[PDB]
Homo-oligomer: A and B are copies of this chain.
């Protein structure tokens, strides 16, 4: 369970479909789009050719943060990288390992907790596409990265989580001891503060400290604005046990209005104390 060195040329098909009640979403199979979009994982140095079809009645696009891409895979109307209704296009994202340039300076790699979103619906910033659900997660791993038993994606989109109605979660389950991975993405108009009862993480790339020499901060509350993305890995219930562990936006009115879910950590027998 560690991430290998990348350098595969991988391929996938992505569709932008309309969903029930105003929503739109990406998906890897027509008829099966989802909010948030399907998780895309790659290893540093991979290349991904995304074979896109807009199946809707309005232009759409696909725009990625942090990964490498030429101006033709930008995903913006300004560059004519959008997709007409019914249209088709192939976006290419690349990645690079870190290393030294000819300069002798250090080039950082592509690894990170990133995301992809529309950039053309509603306005030329994607405002109404993001709002409708056109977003999702991409993880790019470094060699030797520790792999999880599970990855869950939490998006604070304006005043919702993953576009869901108020006080509907989502909830996620695990078993005590599971290495659980969280991808956290924020979108829209408002700043937020992500809080987890019972668990904490480092505020670096991996969410876990390099070792005793790692100056990274350890936190359980993280301010995030539109298009911030971060992620971490927590041992489920470490030092605290099983339970319905609340996670929420800690802005008080935001938590009060619905931006809450449960991290249901289970005992080996499958039962949750108090739930």
Contacts and interface: CB of A to CB of B under 8 A. Distances in A.
Contacts of A96: 239
A169 interface: no
Contacts of A65: 195, 220-221
Contacts of A6: none
Interface-central residue, A238, A241, A273, A274, by most chain B CB under 10 Å: A274
Chain A contact residues, majority secondary structure:
loop
A178 to B, nearest CB: 12
B191 A191 contact: yes
A30 interface: no
Contact of A106 (B98, B211, B253): B211
Interface stretch (A15-23, A54-62, A83-91, A199-207): A199-207
Given A189-B251, A243-B79, A198 B69 contact: yes
Contact of A208 (B106, B191, B211, B246): B106
A66 B220 contact: yes
A215 B218 contact: no
A74 interface: yes
Contacts of A230: 217
B209 A108 contact: yes
Contact of A74 (B74, B126, B243, B260): B243
16 contacts: A65-B220, A70-B241, A71-B240, A98-B209, A101-B235, A106-B208, A106-B211, A109-B218, A123-B255, A123-B256, A126-B252, A187-B252, A188-B251, A191-B191, A204-B215, A221-B229
